[PDB]
Structure 1
Amino acid sequence: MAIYADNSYSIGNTPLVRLKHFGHNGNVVVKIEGRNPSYSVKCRIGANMVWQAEKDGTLTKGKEIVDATSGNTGIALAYVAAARGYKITLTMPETMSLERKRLLCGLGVNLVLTEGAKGMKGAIAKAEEIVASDPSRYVMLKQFENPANPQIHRETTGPEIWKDTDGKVDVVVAGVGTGGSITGISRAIKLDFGKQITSVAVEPVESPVISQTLAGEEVKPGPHKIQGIGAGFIPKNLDLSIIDRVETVDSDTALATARRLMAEEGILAGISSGAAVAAADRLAKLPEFADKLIVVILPSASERYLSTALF
């Protein structure tokens, strides 16, 4: 038939929409990862990191999920925990938007707010304390280094892009947070489908640690408003070997592009979706990419950024 046993199995199969006010002669095509169980790309890894943990016995009945995240990964793990019957504790600074806090409370996760001045480090700290108090009961999924992260993109997101474009995709543009998306997609298309595309990583110009690293320059991260990317470091789940190009975008332009997506394309896209498009638009208007079909990842949806500068 086509009936999913729980909500975690309904992930993926996100659509491709062709942009009309970006690129040149419709060479920019976006992938709407907002059309997911919890309305973000993270739904794929929230599912697979849990499925994998079960498969190798690290996650069993009675066990409890504890992790640190202040983005869509928390919402992704939350719905999967609920759908599959796991208790879950998520740690994050008390600096979080009340909107997302109530959303998580609606999903039945134990909220642990760490000190604001501590930030994420304090969040990871508390989460690691909790696990340490009962290492037999608690399990941390660790999105940045868990191989289950980019693996699911190699098995789903990548093949979806390949099938929908009939293998005519020449470029993939994606922001980097955990790096799992670009890694899995690139690995899928370059190795499993054997086509030598151009993988483009997008990062904030405010915190361009990938551009700085590849050039041997001094790594100097910084604050930005492009939620979802710009971790300030190189994640283990970012495979540099498959990265062909690194584009940088500023927050202000990324915001503007996201507004343009709504008012002009009729696409409810997130902030990082604007950054990814703004970068692809730049490439698309290069005569070297005029022939090339450019597929862009739109990680999330607008209504998640209601209380932000997006509106």
Structure 2
Amino acid sequence: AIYADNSYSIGNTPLVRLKHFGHNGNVVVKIEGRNPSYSVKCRIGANMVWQAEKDGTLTKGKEIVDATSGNTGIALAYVAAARGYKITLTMPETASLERKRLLCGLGVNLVLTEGMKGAIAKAEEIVASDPSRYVMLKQFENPANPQIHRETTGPEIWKDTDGKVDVVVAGVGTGGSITGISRAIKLDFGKQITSVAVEPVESPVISQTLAGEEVKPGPHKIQGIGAGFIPKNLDLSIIDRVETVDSDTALATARRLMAEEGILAGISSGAAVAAADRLAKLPEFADKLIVVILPSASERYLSTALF
């Protein structure tokens, strides 16, 4: 059919079988790069706006305000444009001039902070400046983030695998993908799959937490994941397994996806695939169907270490 605006066009992303990873085609990847603003966040940018509309906190005239590390801001920005909201996003000077020119092209009003914690508080300052005019959508805790994955991404995986999916592998940024997907397949369709969270070995706060160890975040290059804390939108209770990956291997795996599979993957896509490949070569998973989320696409990383 014909979508009334670009937000309604989210999802229905394809599954592709890998040939040079896993064992006898048991690893399949979900291309979230094929979305309105070209990442997995287009789904939650749409649903967080829709749900704020459904409950009246977002109205004609009110202005979206928020802080992002990038993909969510781009996603909110295209939805704000498609649906006629003004939007302000808080960015320090930390960020790719890439993104500054992209967000400005999408009509965003931007700022300065000089890292993530600093821009967040600045956004909070603005919402305080006029709480009747400004709405903050808060991706890390808004339930509409995992909800859209339970309603679209999860069911798409179920149908495209004819219920044969056994393992879902996804890096954790806000936690909404692994959480919403796991709830759809385990609770709505009733299949006891293995849900595998992926985080950087440099910042393994989820593994450290579950082990009852000292939580010690650190720096890494795997953009989009490893926020350095446990987000509210990560439902620990549905997580069966945590796999850690290092930045170097994440980047090499993404370069392999391009050059060997013809898949224009982002950095965190190589991270998720490297974890899935490790599981796929354990005999306990060799006969099981593993589905891996590839959150973003290669061209958003042209100024990064990926090239």
The two structures have a TM-score, normalised by structure 1, of: 0.98
- What is the deviation of 1:112? 1.1
- What is the deviation of 1:66? 0.3
Count of residue pairs brought into register by the alignment: 307
- What is the deviation of 1:100? 0.8
Provide, for residues 130-168 of structure 1, a one-character-per-residue CA deviation record: whole Å limited to 9, x for no partner: 000100000000000000000000000000000000000
Q: How does 1:121-270 map to 2 (within 5 A)?
A: 121-270=117-266
- What is the deviation of 1:110? 0.2
- What is the deviation of 1:105? 0.3
User: What is the match of residue 101 of structure 1?
Assistant: 100
- What is the deviation of 1:85? 0.2
User: What is the match of residue 294 of structure 1?
Assistant: 290
- What is the deviation of 1:63? 0.2
- What is the deviation of 1:93? 1.5
Tell me the C-alpha RMSD between the 2 structures.
Answer: 0.4
- In 1, are the aligned partners of 2:69 and 2:224 still within 8 Å (CA)? no
User: What is the match of residue 42 of structure 1?
Assistant: 41
Q: Hey, what's the Cα distance between the residues in 2 that align with 1:84 and 1:219?
A: 41
- What is the deviation of 1:71? 1.7
- In 1, are the aligned partners of 2:276 and 2:292 still within 8 Å (CA)? yes
Q: Hey, what's the Cα distance between the residues in 1 that align with 2:127 and 2:221?
A: 31
Q: Hey, what's the Cα distance between the residues in 2 that align with 1:20 and 1:288?
A: 20
Provide, for residues 70-89 of structure 1, a one-character-per-residue CA deviation record: whole Å limited to 9, x for no partner: 22000000000000000000
User: What is the match of residue 271 of structure 1?
Assistant: 267
Provide, for residues 198-225 of structure 1, a one-character-per-residue CA deviation record: whole Å limited to 9, x for no partner: 0000000000000000000000000100
Q: Hey, what's the Cα distance between the residues in 2 that align with 1:14 and 1:89?
A: 29
- What is the deviation of 1:68? 0.4
Q: Hey, what's the Cα distance between the residues in 2 that align with 1:299 and 1:159?
A: 17
- What is the deviation of 1:51? 0.2
Provide, for residues 91-121 of structure 1, a one-character-per-residue CA deviation record: whole Å limited to 9, x for no partner: 0211111011100000000011212xxx111
Q: Hey, what's the Cα distance between the residues in 2 that align with 1:257 and 1:80?
A: 32
Q: Hey, what's the Cα distance between the residues in 1 that align with 2:118 and 2:233?
A: 22
- What is the deviation of 1:125? 0.8
Q: Hey, what's the Cα distance between the residues in 2 that align with 1:105 and 1:202?
A: 32
Q: Hey, what's the Cα distance between the residues in 2 that align with 1:146 and 1:223?
A: 26
Moved over 6 A (4+): none
Identity score, percent: 100
Q: Hey, what's the Cα distance between the residues in 2 that align with 1:92 and 1:249?
A: 27
- What is the deviation of 1:289? 0.1
Q: Hey, what's the Cα distance between the residues in 1 that align with 2:230 and 2:71?
A: 19
- What is the deviation of 1:26? 0.2
Partner-residue secondary structure (3-state), 1:207: coil
Q: Hey, what's the Cα distance between the residues in 2 that align with 1:122 and 1:243?
A: 30
Provide, for residues 30-67 of structure 1, a one-character-per-residue CA deviation record: whole Å limited to 9, x for no partner: 00000000000000000000000000000000000000
Give ranges in structure 1 of 5+ residues lacking alignment: none
Q: Hey, what's the Cα distance between the residues in 1 that align with 2:189 and 2:219?
A: 37
Q: Hey, what's the Cα distance between the residues in 1 that align with 2:251 and 2:277?
A: 14
Q: Hey, what's the Cα distance between the residues in 2 that align with 1:71 and 1:153?
A: 19
